[PDB]
Amino acid sequence: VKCTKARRLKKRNLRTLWINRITAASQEHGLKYPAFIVNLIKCQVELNRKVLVDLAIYEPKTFKSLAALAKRRQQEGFAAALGDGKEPEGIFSRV
Amino acid sequence: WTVVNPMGLLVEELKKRNISAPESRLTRQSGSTTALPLYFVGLYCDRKLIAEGPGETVLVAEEEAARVALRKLYGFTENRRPWDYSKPK
Amino acid sequence: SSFSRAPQQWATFARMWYLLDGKMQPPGKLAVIASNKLQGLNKPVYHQLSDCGDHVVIINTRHIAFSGNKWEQKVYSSHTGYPGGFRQVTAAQLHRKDPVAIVKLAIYGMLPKNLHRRTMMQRLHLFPDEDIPEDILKNLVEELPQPRRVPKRLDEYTQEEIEAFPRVWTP
Amino acid sequence: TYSSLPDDYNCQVDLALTADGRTIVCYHPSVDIPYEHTKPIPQPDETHEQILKAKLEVRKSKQLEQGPMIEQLSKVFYTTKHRWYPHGQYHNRRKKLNPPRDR
Amino acid sequence: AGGQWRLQQGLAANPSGYGPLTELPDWSFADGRPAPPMKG
Amino acid sequence: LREVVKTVIEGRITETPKATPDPPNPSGQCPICRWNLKHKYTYEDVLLLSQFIRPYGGMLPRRVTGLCREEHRKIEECVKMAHRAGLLPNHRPQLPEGCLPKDKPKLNRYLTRWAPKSVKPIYKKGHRWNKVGMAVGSPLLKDNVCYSRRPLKMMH
Amino acid sequence: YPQGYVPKTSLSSPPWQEVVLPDPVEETRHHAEVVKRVNELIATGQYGRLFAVVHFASHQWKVTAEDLILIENELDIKCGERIRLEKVLLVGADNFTLLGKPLLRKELVRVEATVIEKTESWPKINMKFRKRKNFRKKKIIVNPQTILRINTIEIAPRL
Amino acid sequence: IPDKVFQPKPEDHEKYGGDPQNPHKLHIVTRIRSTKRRPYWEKDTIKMLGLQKAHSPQIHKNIPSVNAKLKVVKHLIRIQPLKLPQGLPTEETMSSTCLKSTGELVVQWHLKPVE
Amino acid sequence: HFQRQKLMAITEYIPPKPAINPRCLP
Amino acid sequence: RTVSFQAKESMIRRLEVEAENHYWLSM
Ligand code: FES
Numbered sequence: 001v002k003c004t005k006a007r008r009l010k011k012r013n014l015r016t017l018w019i020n021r022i023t024a025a026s027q028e029h030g031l032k033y034p035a036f037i038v039n040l041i042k043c044q045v046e047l048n049r050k051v052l053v054d055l056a057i058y059e060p061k062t063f064k065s066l067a068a069l070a071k072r073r074q075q076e077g078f079a080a081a082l083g084d085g086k087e088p089e090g091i092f093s094r095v
Numbered sequence: 096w097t098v099v100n101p102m103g104l105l106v107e108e109l110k111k112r113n114i115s116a117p118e119s120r121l122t123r124q125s126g127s128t129t130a131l132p133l134y135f136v137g138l139y140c141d142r143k144l145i146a147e148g149p150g151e152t153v154l155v156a157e158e159e160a161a162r163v164a165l166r167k168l169y170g171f172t173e174n175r176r177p178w179d180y181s182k183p184k
Numbered sequence: 185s186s187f188s189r190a191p192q193q194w195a196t197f198a199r200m201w202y203l204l205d206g207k208m209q210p211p212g213k214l215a216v217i218a219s220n221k222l223q224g225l226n227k228p229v230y231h232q233l234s235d236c237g238d239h240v241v242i243i244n245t246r247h248i249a250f251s252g253n254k255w256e257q258k259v260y261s262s263h264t265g266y267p268g269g270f271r272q273v274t275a276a277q278l279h280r281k282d283p284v285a286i287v288k289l290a291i292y293g294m295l296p297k298n299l300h301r302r303t304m305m306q307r308l309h310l311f312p313d314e315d316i317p318e319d320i321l322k323n324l325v326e327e328l329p330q331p332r333r334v335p336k337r338l339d340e341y342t343q344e345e346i347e348a349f350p351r352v353w354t355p
Numbered sequence: 356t357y358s359s360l361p362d363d364y365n366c367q368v369d370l371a372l373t374a375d376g377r378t379i380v381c382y383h384p385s386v387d388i389p390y391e392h393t394k395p396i397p398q399p400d401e402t403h404e405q406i407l408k409a410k411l412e413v414r415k416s417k418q419l420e421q422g423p424m425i426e427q428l429s430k431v432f433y434t435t436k437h438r439w440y441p442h443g444q445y446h447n448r449r450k451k452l453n454p455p456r457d458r
Numbered sequence: 459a460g461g462q463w464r465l466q467q468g469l470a471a472n473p474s475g476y477g478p479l480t481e482l483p484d485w486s487f488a489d490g491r492p493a494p495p496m497k498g
Numbered sequence: 499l500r501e502v503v504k505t506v507i508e509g510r511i512t513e514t515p516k517a518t519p520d521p522p523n524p525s526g527q528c529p530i531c532r533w534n535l536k537h538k539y540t541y542e543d544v545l546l547l548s549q550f551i552r553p554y555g556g557m558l559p560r561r562v563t564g565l566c567r568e569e570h571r572k573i574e575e576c577v578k579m580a581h582r583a584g585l586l587p588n589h590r591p592q593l594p595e596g597c598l599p600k601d602k603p604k605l606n607r608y609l610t611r612w613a614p615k616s617v618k619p620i621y622k623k624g625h626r627w628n629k630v631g632m633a634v635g636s637p638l639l640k641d642n643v644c645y646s647r648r649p650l651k652m653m654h
Numbered sequence: 655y656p657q658g659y660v661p662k663t664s665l666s667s668p669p670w671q672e673v674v675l676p677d678p679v680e681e682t683r684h685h686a687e688v689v690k691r692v693n694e695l696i697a698t699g700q701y702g703r704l705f706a707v708v709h710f711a712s713h714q715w716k717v718t719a720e721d722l723i724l725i726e727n728e729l730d731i732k733c734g735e736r737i738r739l740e741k742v743l744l745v746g747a748d749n750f751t752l753l754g755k756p757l758l759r760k761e762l763v764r765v766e767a768t769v770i771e772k773t774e775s776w777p778k779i780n781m782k783f784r785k786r787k788n789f790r791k792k793k794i795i796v797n798p799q800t801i802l803r804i805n806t807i808e809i810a811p812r813l
Numbered sequence: 814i815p816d817k818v819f820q821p822k823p824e825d826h827e828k829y830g831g832d833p834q835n836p837h838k839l840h841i842v843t844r845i846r847s848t849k850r851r852p853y854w855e856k857d858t859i860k861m862l863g864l865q866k867a868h869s870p871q872i873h874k875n876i877p878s879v880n881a882k883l884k885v886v887k888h889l890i891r892i893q894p895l896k897l898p899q900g901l902p903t904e905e906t907m908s909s910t911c912l913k914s915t916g917e918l919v920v921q922w923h924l925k926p927v928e
Numbered sequence: 929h930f931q932r933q934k935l936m937a938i939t940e941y942i943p944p945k946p947a948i949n950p951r952c953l954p
Numbered sequence: 955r956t957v958s959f960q961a962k963e964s965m966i967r968r969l970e971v972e973a974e975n976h977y978w979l980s981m
Contacts, residue, residue: 025228041460065381128319173186175702177719249606350518371688379753488736531952538665566951836981
């Protein structure tokens with residue numbers, strides 16, 4: 001029974017580990033975890049959390065570029081909020 | 096391939112290419128006085144870093160840095176194009 | 185990339201030494217940061233069983249600042265375990281007896297309630313004053329900015345700033 | 356200065372949407388440390404094993420007792436004495452003989 | 459997360475809803491022969 | 499401003515430096531109203547506070563300042579907090595003839611609503627549902643603009 | 655001081671600092687310049703090992719040369735037959751990477767792999783909780799499995 | 814509850830974007846909560862309406878009987894007016910239909926991003 | 929119940945903020 | 955038991971959604 005119960009919680013625990021590693025990596029670049037995910041979603045990026053951890057570990061240069069995209073979208077997102085919507089969509093915010 | 100004295104071998108290749116021998120420098124260091132020291136040694140040729148390797152001691156770091164250069168010299172980089180088994184010809 | 189397996193493992197799993205200044209800094213904010221550094225949460229590959237904690241060095245703990253009246257209102261309670269062994273001491277009294285005790289207690293409480301906490305405390309180095317052994321400085325890799333920006337006093341204010349500042353009313 | 360992140364530490368990041376706009380291209384050439392920002396190798400002219408032996412010096416009563424030996428070991432590695440104590444035969448036999456290793 | 463923003467853009471809140479990622483075939487033959495339609 | 503010179507003693511009224519011309523918001527009844535500073539000053543803003551404080555840290559009368567009562571209470575609290583935080587080294591209390599301070603270590607404090615002397619220690623902290631709350635900040639400054647998502651935690 | 659002038663202070667300005675984005679017209683020129691260099695890089699084949707992220711079934715698989723991927727279900731494909739994965743969202747090179755929105759064009763990237771083995775899962779124990787559980791209330795799960803070997807990753811300068 | 818609640822106002826029409834004339838014909842209803850711990854009459858209505866599974870799309874007519882039934886279960890459902898930008902689907906296009914979250918049922922799916 | 933307490937808070941009236949206080953009025 | 959801010963918003967959303975249901979049932 002214990003093994004059967006562990007099956008459900010095991011998947012949840014693994015997801016928690018992936019999120020924690022992303023948060024540590026994101027904070028090192030100065031980006032909070034919620035901001036990185038939201039900006040990536042705004043960029044039509046559908047990478048899963050497990051892969052996100054993988055890219056940082058083995059592709060630090062790519063992850064930094066990914067961080068810049070999230071940061072750049074965040075900058076455009078801040079500009080859009082400051083713009084109040086009157087301004088047109090940003091170059092990187094075009095969908 | 097068993098390679099002894101990488102520093103000497105690296106110099107031997109460089110002189111063949113008419114390149115100056117690199118000047119070793121300590122790029123990064125951590126826990127130098129601790130029992131678990133990490134030393135990063137970069138080989139600088141004409142004041143330009145050609146290869147850097149990690150090691151526990153400066154000698155190990157220098158030896159490791161030389162090993163990295165030898166791979167680069169022979170085009171054996173880890174990110175190099177994989178060999179092809181696809182070719183039917 | 186292209187490095188040998190063992191050196192790469194050594195570098196990735198190596199432990200770093202950090203320096204912290206406690207002068208006019210709230211221990212609670214420092215403790216939260218200290219817990220992150222001590223436990224090894226500052227690394228992207230942090231794992232619970234990887235023993236990736238880092239060394240933390242704290243100095244100027246004698247000059248820490250507590251918000252509000254926490255100096256006189258915060259009471260630390262301990263029990264010797266014998267009848268009538270209940271001891272209650274205010275924060276101000278504890279600092280007078282030991283400047284470093286308050287910082288250690290806050291960090292210990294913030295740290296996880298597990299066996300690994302005791303090992304983490306060993307890696308923690310608390311200095312009442314700026315004095316540090318030289319070898320620790322060689323071990324030290326980086327220093328961390330103070331969590332709280334220190335406000336300037338009236339004397340600290342520059343003369344040019346006074347001229348720039350306008351007179352709201354005329355006495 | 357189009358890149359939103361500093362390019363001075365890890366690698367230069369060049370962000371560029373494709374002309375069609377269907378793709379985002381990131382160019383990340385690595386950056387080497389400047390020569391002026393590095394330290395030279397120690398000019399003055401010893402193996403770590405010797406240092407380790409020196410750290411665990413045998414000074415008093417020839418070889419020291421187990422407790423002091425553990426304390427000396429604990430001090431060097433900043434560990435607790437409890438870790439160094441051995442374990443009984445029951446658990447020792449239970450240890451797996453052939454642990455799997457991948458990568 | 460992001461369901462609200464996806465709805466704002468007109469997309470499904472859950473990426474697993476109506477979209478090319480789910481609807482489109484996930485593979486094809488190396489020879490180029492189209493893969494059979496997914497049972498789902 | 500009247501100053502007495504010293505038996506025969508004579509007092510001279512002297513001209514005072516004037517406020518900077520062109521206040522940002524003319525027609526304001528109070529100087530804070532005139533300068534649009536209602537919700538943008540804090541105890542850390544010693545420069546503004548110093549203008550209304552005596553050389554030894556005493557509060558100036560409201561009538562002389564001319565500001566409204568609401569700002570008077572806010573300014574008084576801000577000044578008191580600065581004094582308790584040692585942010586006014588030049589406005590410390592006057593030594594009468596030759597007296598000297600406690601000459602004992604002084605604990606660094608800030609954001610102190612009340613005097614440390616008159617606050618007793620909280621021996622019983624309380625449990626989750628009985629936890630005691632410690633006030634931080636001043637109610638008089640509730641209206642000040644906040645740049646955080648949620649209102650600041652007055653009670654710690 | 656002019657009417658309605660507020661000097662910058664702790665509470666006058668927000669903790670965050672406003673920034674000004676670069677002008678678009680010159681920025682668009684920057685976009686093209688990077689693309690032109692990248693197209694030459696792809697044309698020159700200045701890359702070695704490549705990594706690609708492929709979405710299959712309900713999972714995303716980061717892929718590299720010689721990689722082995724196990725799929726926990728049958729595929730209906732004979733062993734030793736090469737197959738092309740059609741859903742790739744990211745591909746990486748030595749100094750450059752390509753990101754789909756949310757997927758790259760089929761022309762740019764083609765990925766092929768081969769089926770190695772069809773297998774099942776080692777028994778998994780399932781036992782629901784109930785009073786008087788008994789030892790015979792046991793069920794085993796041996797769901798199917800399949801093995802895939804990555805063969806090739808192909809890109810072209812089709813920007 | 815007074816009938817005024819279900820009597821719309823001009824401002825309400827603008828907020829919900831519903832034209833008082835040519836009222837929408839079909840309701841879109843999905844169950845978002847459980848019927849457990851609810852009275853029997855509420856349970857019966859949900860079963861009759863066919864909303865046994867949560868988040869299940871259902872096509873129903875905007876008629877008084879359906880309207881009366883929907884009002885009983887209003888708090889457990891989300892009501893959206895169906896929209897047909899391209900009109901009713903044809904027999905040939907019946908296999909190409911697709912309903913978007915916005916409430917628009919397209920009769921042709923071209924597998925091209927809206928962008 | 930927790931939900932009932934939520935209703936009580938909702939009943940609280942939301943007052944608009946005057947532009948200028950009477951003392952600081954023009 | 956003081957009400958958390960999150961709970962209040964959730965209840966408001968449910969009421970607002972129910973209000974939309976009322977309007978679409980008003981025609
Ligand atoms: S700000 Fe106008 S009276 Fe106070």
